[PDB]
Amino acid sequence: ATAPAERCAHPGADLGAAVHAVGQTLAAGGLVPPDEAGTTARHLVRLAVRYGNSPFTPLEEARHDLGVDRDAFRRLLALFGQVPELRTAVETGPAGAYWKNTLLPLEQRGVFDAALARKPVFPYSVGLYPGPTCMFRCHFCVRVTGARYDPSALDAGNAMFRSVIDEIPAGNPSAMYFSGGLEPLTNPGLGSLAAHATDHGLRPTVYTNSFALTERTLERQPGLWGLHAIRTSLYGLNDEEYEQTTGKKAAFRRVRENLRRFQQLRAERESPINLGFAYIVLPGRASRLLDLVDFIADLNDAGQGRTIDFVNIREDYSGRDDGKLPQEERAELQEALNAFEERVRERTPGLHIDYGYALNSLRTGADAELLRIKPATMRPTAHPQVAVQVDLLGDVYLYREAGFPDLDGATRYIAGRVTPDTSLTEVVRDFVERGGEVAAVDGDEYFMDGFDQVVTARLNQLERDAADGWEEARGFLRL
Amino acid sequence: ATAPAERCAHPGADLGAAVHAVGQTLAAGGLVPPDEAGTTARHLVRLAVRYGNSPFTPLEEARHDLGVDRDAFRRLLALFGQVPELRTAVETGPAGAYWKNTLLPLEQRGVFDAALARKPVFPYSVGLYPGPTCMFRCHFCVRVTGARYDPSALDAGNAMFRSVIDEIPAGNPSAMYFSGGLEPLTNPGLGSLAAHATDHGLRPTVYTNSFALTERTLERQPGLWGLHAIRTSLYGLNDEEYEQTTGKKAAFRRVRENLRRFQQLRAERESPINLGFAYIVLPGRASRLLDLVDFIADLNDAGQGRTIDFVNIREDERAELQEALNAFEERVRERTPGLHIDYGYALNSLRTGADAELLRIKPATMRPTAHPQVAVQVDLLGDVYLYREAGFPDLDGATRYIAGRVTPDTSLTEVVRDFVERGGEVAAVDGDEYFMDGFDQVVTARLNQLERDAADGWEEARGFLRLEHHHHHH
Amino acid sequence: APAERCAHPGADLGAAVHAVGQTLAAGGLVPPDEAGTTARHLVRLAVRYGNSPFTPLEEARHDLGVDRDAFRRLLALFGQVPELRTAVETGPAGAYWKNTLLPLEQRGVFDAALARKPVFPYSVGLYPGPTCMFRCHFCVRVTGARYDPSALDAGNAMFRSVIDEIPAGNPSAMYFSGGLEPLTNPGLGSLAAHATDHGLRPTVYTNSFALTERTLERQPGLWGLHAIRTSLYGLNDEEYEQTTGKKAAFRRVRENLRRFQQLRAERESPINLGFAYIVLPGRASRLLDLVDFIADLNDAGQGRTIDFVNIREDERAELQEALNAFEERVRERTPGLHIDYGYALNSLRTGADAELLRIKPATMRPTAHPQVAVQVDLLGDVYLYREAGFPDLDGATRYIAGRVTPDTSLTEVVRDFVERGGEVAAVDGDEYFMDGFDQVVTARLNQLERDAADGWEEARGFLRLEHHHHHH
Amino acid sequence: APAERCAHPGADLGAAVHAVGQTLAAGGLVPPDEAGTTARHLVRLAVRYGNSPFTPLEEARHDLGVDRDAFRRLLALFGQVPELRTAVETGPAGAYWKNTLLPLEQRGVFDAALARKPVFPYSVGLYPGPTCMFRCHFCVRVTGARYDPSALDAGNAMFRSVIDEIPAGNPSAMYFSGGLEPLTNPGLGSLAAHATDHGLRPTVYTNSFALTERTLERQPGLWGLHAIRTSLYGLNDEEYEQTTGKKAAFRRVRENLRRFQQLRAERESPINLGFAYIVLPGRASRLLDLVDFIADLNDAGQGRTIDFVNIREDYSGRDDGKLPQEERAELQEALNAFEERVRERTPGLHIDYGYALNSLRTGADAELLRIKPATMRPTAHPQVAVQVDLLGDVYLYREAGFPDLDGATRYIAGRVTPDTSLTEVVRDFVERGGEVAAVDGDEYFMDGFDQVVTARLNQLERDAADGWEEARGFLRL
Ligand SMILES: C[S@+](CC[C@H](N)C(=O)[O-])C[C@H]1O[C@@H](n2cnc3c(N)ncnc32)[C@H](O)[C@@H]1O
Ligand SMILES: C[S@@+](CC[C@H](N)C(=O)[O-])C[C@H]1O[C@@H](n2cnc3c(N)ncnc32)[C@H](O)[C@@H]1O
Ligand code: MET
Ligand code: MET
Ligand code: SF4
Ligand code: SF4
Ligand code: SF4
Ligand code: SF4
Ligand code: NA
């Protein structure tokens, strides 16, 4: 039971019932004289349909589609702000994951403004890549087989990591995270890094494959119990699936036993740490969502009522065909996702689910694919105000999928190196002040993760709107 | 077609219909065996009514009102978190202005957590008080007649403000605001401070009486145009009303012509700056709200279609006052349809006819550590005041609430960190309670409630309702 | 439950719309974006039929403003929200649905009248009294009119032949009432015993003025009746003379009933005792004195109490709490007394602003409803409406469907009239021939005939049947 | 009101006695000192008859320990506390009172059988199917036994004359069920249309295996029925094969019902559609899946939904149909989740429970009656119910009307022929006092309804023989 105007962006929505409800809101509120309430309510609903599906549409394109004067578009933008049901229709429409998860949270904190003005500010999201190696060979990962960091570089690297954590301003508990190009649990001092950050006032999350998340590892790295959460990347639901995805035999059994035992130890400790999973839906595995619930239910039985906290249903953001789901399987995801939610409430009620940008559109039946930024649409200054990444050697990478050792072309996206004489603040500040740029060549676009590609499309939308004279109204929705 | 479970906190609400809806939500979710769905729903609804009207109620007092034992209260709280219509009843109840405007936003940002834990944190809300002087003498204001800052403080104070602005971390463009004890526009370098803050990535609001917001000031201080908003404290609707409030003659005509001309320049410059007004409704004169709409309508005519953005309405007869705000809203829709309205905490509850329960912190209920993690204020001398109304020169007893002084050798970050880390405290004496503005009293009432709940063994459930940080994982 | 209460005055209609909106959405009955608009139409239907049960479906559709196909969908969706059917059956007009319309629809009583088919009447009134000793100012009986005393035996044999015609399946299909007073027939006890032997359990409706011990000895078969309901025309001698025109009539009636209470307990007779009482405008405080009247009767029956009362009607918040006081004093003084109100009085409780039906000549159905109810007087004349069976009543003979004779049964009187399409064109004043039941049956048949002609043959009457398969 | 629910398990008996005692004292029915002990006796009676409706009055008096003068006053006092009658009728045994006992006393049906008088049967079952294609393990039909196909013409003419005999006043007094499957009679639609023109509203009780589109095409009079109730024997192909013996039986029954849903919505037929569903051993956890089956049929109906579901058990008590004590105890919880699942997904679906199943919700353990040869009435109850098969044979019990069932012929009251009507068959058997001596096995000729009527007529005859003729059956109204 929902209001018509709040659902007016999803497929098959009664646009007439929405224009009527909006028109009454404008008339009753005195915003539009009653004789024109119907006309403008149609323009307003059309704007909400568009940005509820394509959040990056430049304002001039939306005005052209309305076939309307600039002054009358300015009035519609102001009028749009007075109709809260249409804002809801955008934020909760098919493309609503864009608005609620990334666009609006970053806009409100001024992060997009700092990058839009090319001003030297501390990065809003600092990624620390502490892992020297990895024991998986995932077909969708850009890491180069065999490439590793020097084992004799761990001590100086972990000392460098502590100094970077000293720079992280408090007030945002999720400002820093431990992830990687490689696998962070292969760093023996990751628990020490976690302790140094929690002692700093941060609540970081570790993103791992959990192959090394053994009970012996928890004993030698007790600081991991102080993290906010551990998100395990889940690459399959049996050994044959894990071997297809990661190339490693018997990998599923050991990852599962590690989380079964971790669930046991979390109960006995009554630790506030959260446990979640990232589950990329891979080609030929859309029918496996039902079995994913059984995997989580199995993990809940080992936790003595302590539940798995969240699950991130995701997609290969690279777009390469080894990860891209065919349209045939894309068409079956609406039924699959809705049935997956039903089973969760049956067997795993307390588990939080959230979907990728395109997956969230597929439920309710709006076809959508993830962005695929090309070198022509890459911003040569990157966005260090939004995010940077630091690996073991102190190198500060401009995009998430560029921080891999011995990756071709990846060194060109190093803004600098954090040394005992140079801080991350100084590396980012000097790269912004001197206007450092990197020209994009073919293949560079694959250094960008899903977040980097969304941040790029947003900054491109804002620069174009400001260039089109819509400086204040840039991005359609903001404050 | 509203849900009665989302409305049960307002007066005259059908509580019977609320317990039926909640009981069905409990039965449908399998949260209670069907025998106790009635008793559990009446308890849960009683909790929603209580906290929808009295948000600071200690959990133990609510439990004693319910008549249930400690263990039953624990599972009642866990069930409350599974009846979302009841959270809405609290959030949108008569006291909903507390929850949605202050309590829950600050809880989500970890602001109350930091003060509760006595963590050395950079203050969430930093007020800069740059005015050396005021030309008004408002009878309600605590400023001391004959008191002002020396002109010799201007240069070093403005450079001090610049260094403090540089200290403010990224992530909240509203972290800093320009207000005062005294009048901010009397600082000739206020526009430069605004430009310095704008370059920093901040979007600051100035709170002023706008008497000095002349064209001469705008040309002397063009950096004011980059502010996010100017909220003018409107002390009346004609000269005689303005003279009884402020003691100055012909002050309404000056403020009005200033705002008429600003509207004109704002339209010509196409400035995105916002314009708002704070108006206090006096006893028995709630009809003057209609004249307020006419005042803004006249301002909207000077702006060539570019209108006034918001109005803050505060108080300081029940059904009458309810009638008068309803008339105020009707005429807004008729004359100023886009004007945003938000009421004070007590006034927001008097709409709906609920009894405005007064918040009067006394010296006994003041927290000796204050709350520098939430808010501090800096005047021209670099003095960091712990409460908003303590930052006035020569104010009796007010220097006792200086946490420290920002100097070229001591930053604001150090002043706050040292005061918190050493456990600095100020023992309250009679009269200190007037140093707290409305915000200080709500923050103190919340921190007293949180501390009482934790001491009572309800640490996780402290404050009844709370938001957490939203950790989204990509 | 707000959705179950939405038909009552001052109900929270917004809460009902939300509740029914959830049911449609959660059940997949309606897309959630239009669950609110459908819910408002469904609640409006429930409010209408919970207050005006006879509204034709086309009238309800026109007030909703939806087309024919949309109304059909709304009627089907309405059958999916059990709380709304409850709102209709327990609304201000719920007594119509629960006490008359739905039970008769279940038994197929209306269907025979709709199809114009010959069946034996569902309700057969026998009027065996030749005279009456009262002259009630409200009664339509003609002063100076009575039945020939030579009509008795001949008519009593006719009555016995009519009793023999009554089929099995409804032991209360026949009752003894009248135009005039039944107890003035010396053979009424014999007719009662004849019906008891037939397997029937009849009730007699009487003013009980002639319910003397002498009458009991002359007509001992009266003890075999299922129940005796006395028409109570007052609570002291003055009121009874005011109503009936007879002096010291209350003294006689109370004397008879207290005597009957003693005799009933000595015989350990299972016969039930009831009373009909009319509350007069503004005098609803006399309901408390009625409880005193019943209590004194109880004290005369040694632990054998009066079984039921029928309270019916002639600002009204003086009435609303007059009935709460009456209801409470019953629990204090006569806790076993079954209370039943009329249609209007039942709606006046709950504060609803509803009247009784007032059928006019233009809305009377020319065929009448012999399949539902007929009445036979001492001459064998079969009357089509209850208040037409009075000798010499002006215009009443036009509503005689036929006469039961040794050569013509009641079954044949009703069959010939129906099959030949017999009709009576209503003239001004004929509407007084219909009692309250006749007006309800007329109003329901008009509604059912209208709905069927409009193309709503299956939804006719809005509410009709249930699902019974417990004997499989 | 604690007195209105004093018959269910977990009731505050002390509070109910307290409230009944004040009713007794306030109303002046009993002196105030004895108001407490009398209220306990009255509450004990309501608890007893709200759980065991067939208890002889002399057994209840012995349980109370009083004598006949006290019992007589207690019966009279019981009628003066209306909340105690509500506690009986809405107690765990309330399905007996509200569905069968009290409605049939109201119609004088029980009095007709009690007085051994010739009245037309209250319930007339027509058994028109010559064969069946299912082999349900709980049915008493014999594998392979069939009716001669050449008997259909004379049988369908006989059925038409029996329908002509049905009296008005009860439009559902006749039904099409059977021993065998009624849809295997090619003239069932004609018999249906014949009764519809008679003014009846009959129901066909079928396994719906033969409810195909071609069958509706050939038997259009089926669309004029009041309702079709499909006996549901499983929720997938495996469950159906386990129960009926036939493979691919569920998918064909479901397809027939899906297509019937499309046909019902196309012509907007008034016909109702419901289901009978026996809770079989090992399947008490399947009630939630039953709602999924119903919603699937609702999706095929385009807004026109399933009207009702009857939840039943094996009324024979045999091992293969009787639910073990363990699984039966799980039924209280299973029913509650079932009803909450119906309320969410199929809110218009009417639900009703068998006699014992209705007691299991609210936690009262009860079993269906198991009549034995010693408690069988030799005259049976033709005034209450009879059944007629293809050959015109009038069977006295529902489960005796099967071809070539051993000993079933001993319970034929007569044969309807062009010379002899059902009325005369029942009249002659009643007027001559026909009786059938019960031999071991005859009790399995009685269905659930038969056993309830027998137990009621035994209780009524026992009460009268004990001198409680007027108070017979405790409740009667
Ligand atoms: C690869 S690093 C994590 C370090 C650790 N070895 C692991 O796999 O969890 C960051 C995250 O990016 C995800 N990821 C890597 N390549 C991806 C791709 N092409 N599409 C979507 N997610 C990808 C991984 O699943 C992991 O959760
Ligand atoms: C004998 S069948 C004949 C009608 C048709 N063949 C059918 O299955 O519905 C009549 C009804 O009795 C039911 N029945 C047969 N044996 C039963 C038993 N032992 N317990 C409960 N019901 C039974 C069947 O399920 C069916 O609904
Ligand atoms: C708290 S006193 C300062 C108020 C401010 N100077 C004004 O007049 O708006
Ligand atoms: C309907 S005429 C009245 C019949 C009966 N003699 C009475 O007084 O009630
Ligand atoms: S995604 Fe993680 S586990 Fe997989 S190959 Fe890359 S670094 Fe290793
Ligand atoms: S309230 Fe503001 S304007 Fe008034 S005297 Fe105080 S400082 Fe001056
Ligand atoms: S109402 Fe009855 S008692 Fe009165 S005059 Fe008429 S027939 Fe006689
Ligand atoms: S119950 Fe019906 S379908 Fe099953 S075997 Fe018996 S006759 Fe056949
Ligand atoms: Na007297």
Numbering used by the authors:
A (entry chain A): 8 to 486
B (entry chain B): 8 to 323, 336 to 493
C (entry chain D): 10 to 323, 336 to 493
D (entry chain C): 10 to 486
Task: Quote from the publication.
DesII is a radical S‐adenosyl‐l‐methione (SAM) enzyme that catalyzes the radical‐mediated deamination of TDP‐4‐amino‐4,6‐dideoxy‐d‐glucose (1) to TDP‐3‐keto‐4,6‐dideoxy‐d‐glucose (2) during the biosynthesis of TDP‐desosamine (3). Like other radical SAM enzymes, the catalytic cycle of DesII is characterized by initial single electron transfer from a reduced, active site [Fe4S4]+ cluster to SAM. Each monomeric unit comprises three domains: an N‐terminal domain of six α‐helices, a central radical SAM (RS) domain, and a C‐terminal domain consisting of a β‐hairpin and two α‐helices. The RS domain (residues S132–L369) coordinates the single [Fe4S4] cluster via residues C141, C145, and C148, which make up the CX3CX2C motif.
The present work reports the 2.33 Å crystal structure of DesII as a binary complex with SAM bound in the active site. The crystal structure of DesII from Streptomyces venezuelae was determined by single anomalous diffraction using a selenomethionine derivative. A single molecule of SAM was found coordinated to the [Fe4S4] cluster in chains a and c with methionine bound in the active sites of chains b and d. The C‐terminal His6‐tags of chains b and d were found to occupy the active site pockets of chains a and c, respectively. Four other previously identified SAM binding motifs including the GGE, ribose, GXIXGXXE, and β 6 motif are also conserved in DesII. The GGE motif (G187–E190) interacts with the Met moiety of SAM via H‐bonding interactions. In contrast, the R238, S240, and Y242 residues at the end of the β 4 strand H‐bond with the SAM ribose moiety to form the “ribose motif” originally described in BioB. The GXIXGXXE motif provides hydrophobic contacts to the adenine ring of SAM, which is further stabilized by backbone interactions with a polar residue in α 5 and hydrophobic interactions with Y324 as found in other radical SAM enzymes. Residue D323 in the loop behind the β 6 strand provides two backbone interactions with N1 and N6 of the adenine base, which is another feature of the β 6 motif. Molecular dynamics (MD) simulations and QM/MM computations were performed to evaluate the energetics of DesII‐catalyzed deamination of 1 based on the structure of the binary DesII·SAM complex.
